[PDB]
């Protein structure tokens with residue numbers, strides 16, 4: 001038993017809800033919240049900009065130190081940093097950004113990072129400003145992640161489309 005509430009169950013291990021991930025994180029304090037990161041951990045907009053704003057820019061300060069030490073992530077890769085006031089940990093995961101021409105097949109590699117964590121609160125990778133089809137992203141999530149994932153979908157309209165079209 002865990003503290004996630006109001007989710008629709010899609011499969012044995014994937015759950016979905018219409019929610020703001022920042023507010024969902026603020027209430028649940030999950031062990032892991034996933035950020036839709038870029039390779040530079042520049043949290044300017046989308047989910048990343050919203051998560052970072054909710055931390056009062058502490059996520060960005062920590063991220064800049066991480067990059068200064070380690071260099072950029074790989075597309076499809078991840079790193080674990082603090083969850084600040086939102087979660088114990090933040091798993092920063094880089095999905096391919098279609099608006100940069102990155103290979104959508106890397107989306108599966110991105111979701112594989114979730115399997116290193118037993119339970120996660122997450123957005124749909126490569127959705128939103130990353131330019132991928134959120135329905136495809138949901139399919140890859142379901143077919144790749146084996147751990148327990150609670151997906152927060154900000155837009156009520158898209159949520160209904162994702163549920164109604166789910167096979």
Ligand SMILES: O=C(O)[C@@H]1CN(c2ncnc3[nH]c4cc(F)ccc4c23)CC12CCC2
Nearest residue numbers: 021036046047050123124127128129130154
């Ligand atoms: O940034 C993107 O392209 C979208 C944003 N989406 C979100 N999903 C779940 N909660 C969210 N709260 C927010 C608050 C904001 F101010 C901006 C975006 C969100 C948001 C998923 C996405 C595809 C992977 C990242």
